[PDB]
Write a structure and sequence with these properties.
about 15% strand; about 220 residues; SARS-CoV-2; glycoprotein; viral protein/immune system; 5 chains; part of a larger assembly; about 45% helix; two-stranded antiparallel sheet; 4 strands; binds a molecule of 2 linked components (NAG-NAG); alpha+beta; binds 2-acetamido-2-deoxy-beta-D-glucopyranose
């Protein structure tokens, strides 16, 4: 068939009418971004020739091609570690959540690390790690998966307990409903709306986080 | 190590910042040469409670450098002269 | 090692040129790497074969050099587009983007020329000497809930004030810096305090 | 079939007509000894960057 | 024969290194984007539209993934919109009144001022409006009273 871009939605425009929202939805969406690759190194002499001495003697007639290829692969291998440093190591302080999870009705158990798991990952991160399955060597990454999870846990603890203050200097503690009210004012909605409808906002946020976990567990 | 066998470095149980990266969480430093599992940062437990806030009373005007490359050396190679002269 | 990013590009380009010049010394399986030696030693039927081997080796080397030169040109173009974005948004204006123009709250920036590069001096504001205060979302007064217009309610232990969020400057909670919305029965954590009227 | 490797004991149970073993990348990683019908894994000899 | 094998394997290895460098450039661009999203969506609140999810961005959560990062963008979506009759200004006592931060709306008989992204009607007063000029210039100005506390 000839495809259709979308449903037509005729906006009821007139010169003296406006549409004002009377309600809201707290929507949580996923964005997956690759950071690094597998660090692969290829022994050029061993790949072309193996253990043959005559082959390596003939290969020396071509000059420094193997040095160029090994240098390029080494540059790629260090660039992957530089990428992981640039993405995850943006804080020099390892922040921790308080033992009492009293955030005014907001539930973060699906994104905070699980103490029962030996990998110290969140249930969402554990599901993400479950859903991803001749002279060649694989160099291990400098940051292991538990230290990357520790970096993400520090970022989560900082953004929960301190808002955006830890990203601009010292971490200044603030109650999470007050922080949410500040975020509400950032998008141009008054603080009162957040405070009056705080139970509804917390319930919508918890439902959206659960729907994120269900959607990740149900989509291949 | 998971990166391989390291000979000539004394493995210690303490955790420091990464000086020379070995890999798989292992880093090396000079103090003799020691090898260790590295530490991401100092733990900073934020004193969270539901009715306390921290307000700054002072400020620091901080100037930082950021170096960004813009261009390279414009190189041209005469292909006929390079191959044949 | 402060200027290592420019020196890395300079060293990579100089090393690529040195490798490309060095590749002329390789015979690539021929009897010699010098064209004049082949042309003065051999008849043209076999000198054609030797020159053909030298030509395909040098052409492979030159194509390789052009390939990493194009890849490095793409990388330098991406870095220069980033530098132009930083010049537009940090120098020619004040940016709300976090960590785009330095660590902290960005105030302004200065450009400085560098050999094949640019150095941005980011002047930023860092909060310091923080102090604990007891805080509340709203003030209950006369059966009405009061919320700060731009600041935050703080308490030093006995008295309630309103202050701006990024600097401690306590002021008396009045009707001029607060607004009224609803009663005190809805907001969780509302406290009782007077609201002055000028 | 010639090569260089470390010959260790294997848990792969061959069918009786089969003699050698290949992985996905078509490299001989399992073999049957002709004298005594036993299966041997052929690990590559260790190599690595210094 | 070994020379033929050498030039074939060297061509294969150079090809592999060429697409490895191209994929490394692509992954580096994606990682620079991911670092930008970590700085601007997680460590702050972003005014950039659709940079940190669909809707008005509130905050974001980072999650580690095998060779990657997953951002949970928490955003605010308006819903249950309602029609109102609107005006640019209110004419009162020969003066034009404009909202300080909101918008004049009418449910059919009465005029109010509300914030733009959420319906919260309030009485049009001198505290939420400002005066600029008379009523003769603004096209579409309507007559309504302005309360004085
Ligand atoms: C605001 O009013 C307009 C017009 O009075 C409404 O637009 C109509 O909606 C109905 C129901 O979907 C359609 O059948 C008409 O074709 C629409 N007319 C036009 C001109 O678009 C609109 O739905 C109202 N908005 C709300 C939120 O009720
Ligand atoms: C705004 O929307 C929310 C849902 O997003 C509404 O909350 C629901 O209200 C119905 C009826 O009162 C209940 O049955 C549901 O259980 C509520 N859902 C949740 C998640 O609490 C809310 O009533 C709406 N408010 C207005 C004024 O329209
Ligand atoms: C926060 O959310 C978690 C997960 O949704 C809640 O844990 C659930 O608790 C119920 C009742 O105790 C159990 O039946 C479920 O099996 C639990 N789920 C999981 C994944 O463990 C938790 O109760 C919520 N509240 C708090 C305060 O943590
Ligand atoms: C605000 O108060 C909290 C708790 O009263 C302080 O946090 C304590 O700080 C001391 C000194 O570093 C530590 O030994 C305690 O372990 C901390 N307690 C907790 C629960 O974290 C905090 O230092 C105070 N802030 C300021 C700026 O004085
Ligand atoms: C805020 O911090 C500045 C320093 O950044 C303080 O200024 C210093 O004050 C001490 C004692 O008054 C002097 O000895 C220094 O010479 C000052 N330094 C500078 C650069 O002027 C300032 O006192 C602090 N203010 C508060 C209220 O804490
Ligand atoms: C909290 O701040 C208020 C205002 O600065 C303090 O009240 C003043 O305290 C001084 C010192 O005793 C008195 O001389 C003033 O007369 C007080 N002003 C008023 C209006 O009462 C208060 O003492 C501070 N509390 C704490 C615990 O530091
Ligand atoms: C804040 O003030 C309100 C109103 O003055 C107090 O609410 C009263 O509480 C008493 C005893 O708890 C009741 O007998 C009254 O009926 C309440 N009145 C209303 C209008 O609710 C409230 O207790 C005060 N809170 C604090 C912490 O002092
Ligand atoms: C528009 O809104 C106003 C204010 O909410 C409405 O006026 C009130 O209407 C109720 C219902 O009849 C009365 O009990 C109140 O006394 C009215 N208040 C005033 C100050 O007059 C008005 O009815 C609404 N109009 C429409 C068409 O919905
Ligand atoms: C809004 O109010 C103004 C002033 O009260 C009205 O303007 C008057 O209109 C009448 C008849 O149209 C004229 O005789 C007067 O001279 C006008 N006065 C001024 C100062 O212009 C205007 O008509 C009103 N508009 C509506 C829609 O009621
Ligand atoms: C804060 O926590 C205390 C218990 O530690 C509780 O008594 C109080 O009601 C809580 N306040 C709010 C606003 O949640
Ligand atoms: C070879 O001889 C051994 C013992 O001498 C015997 O166990 C083995 O089965 C023989 N091989 C075959 C293929 O029969
Ligand atoms: C809006 O359009 C109507 C006709 O549909 C017209 O009478 C009125 O003057 C217009 N108002 C403005 C402000 O343009």
């Amino acid at each position: 068939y000839t495809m259709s871009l979308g449903a037509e939605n005729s906006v009821a425009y007139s010169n003296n009418s406006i549409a004002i929202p009377t309600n809201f939805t707290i929507s949580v969406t996923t964005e997956i971004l690759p950071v690094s690759m597998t660090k692969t190194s290829v022994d050029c002499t061993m790949y072309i020739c193996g253990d043959s001495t005559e082959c390596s003697n003939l290969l020396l007639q071509y000059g420094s091609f193997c040095t160029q290829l090994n240098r390029a692969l080494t540059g790629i291998a260090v660039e992957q570690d530089k990428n992981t440093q640039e993405v995850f190591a943006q804080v020099k302080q390892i922040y921790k959540t308080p033992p009492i999870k009293d955030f005014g009705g907001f539930n973060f158990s699906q994104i905070l690390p699980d103490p029962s798991k030996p990998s110290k990952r969140s249930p969402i991160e554990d599901l993400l790690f479950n859903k991803v399955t001749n002279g060649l060597t694989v160099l291990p990454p400098l940051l292991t998966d538990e230290m990357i999870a520790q970096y993400t846990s520090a970022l989560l603890a900082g953004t929960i307990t301190s808002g955006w203050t830890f990203g601009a200097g010292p971490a200044l503690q603030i109650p999470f409903p007050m922080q949410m009210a500040y975020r509400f004012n950032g998008i141009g909605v008054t603080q009162n709306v957040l405070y009056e409808n705080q139970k509804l906002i917390a319930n919508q946020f918890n439902s959206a986080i659960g729907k994120i976990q269900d959607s990740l567990s149900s989509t291949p | 190590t998971r990166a391989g066998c390291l000979i000539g470095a004394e493995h210690v149980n303490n955790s420091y910042e990464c000086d020379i990266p070995i890999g798989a969480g292992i880093c090396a430093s000079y103090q003799s040469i020691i090898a260790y599992t590295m530490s991401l940062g100092a733990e900073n437990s934020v004193a969270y409670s539901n009715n306390s806030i921290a307000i700054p009373t002072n400020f620091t005007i901080s100037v930082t450098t950021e170096i960004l490359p813009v261009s390279m050396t414009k190189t041209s190679v005469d292909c006929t002269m390079y191959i044949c002269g | 090692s402060a200027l290592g990013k420019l020196q890395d590009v300079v060293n990579q380009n100089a090393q690529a040129l040195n490798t490309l010049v060095k590749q002329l010394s390789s015979n690539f399986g021929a009897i010699s790497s010098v064209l004049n030696d082949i042309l003065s030693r051999l008849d043209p039927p076999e000198a054609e074969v030797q020159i053909d081997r030298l030509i395909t080796g040098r052409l492979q080397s030159l194509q390789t050099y052009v390939t990493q030169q194009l890849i490095r040109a793409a990388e330098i173009r991406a870095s220069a587009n980033l530098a132009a974005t930083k010049m537009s948004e940090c120098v020619l204006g004040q940016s709300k983007r976090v960590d785009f123009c330095g660590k902290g709250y960005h105030l302004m920036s200065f450009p400085q020329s560098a050999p094949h590069g640019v150095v941005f001096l980011h002047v930023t504001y860092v909060p310091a000497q923080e102090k604990n205060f007891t805080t509340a979302p709203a003030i209950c007064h006369d059966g009405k809930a009061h919320f700060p217009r731009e600041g935050v309610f703080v308490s030093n232990g006995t008295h309630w004030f309103v202050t701006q969020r990024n600097f401690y400057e306590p002021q008396i909670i009045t009707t001029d810096n607060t607004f009224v919305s609803g009663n005190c029965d809805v907001v969780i954590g509302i406290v009782n305090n007077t609201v002055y009227d000028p | 079939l010639t090569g260089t490797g470390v010959l260790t004991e294997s848990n792969k149970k061959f069918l009786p007509f089969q003699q050698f073993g290949r992985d996905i990348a078509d490299t001989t990683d399992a073999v049957r000894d002709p004298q005594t019908l036993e299966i041997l894994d052929i690990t590559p000899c260790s190599f690595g960057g210094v």
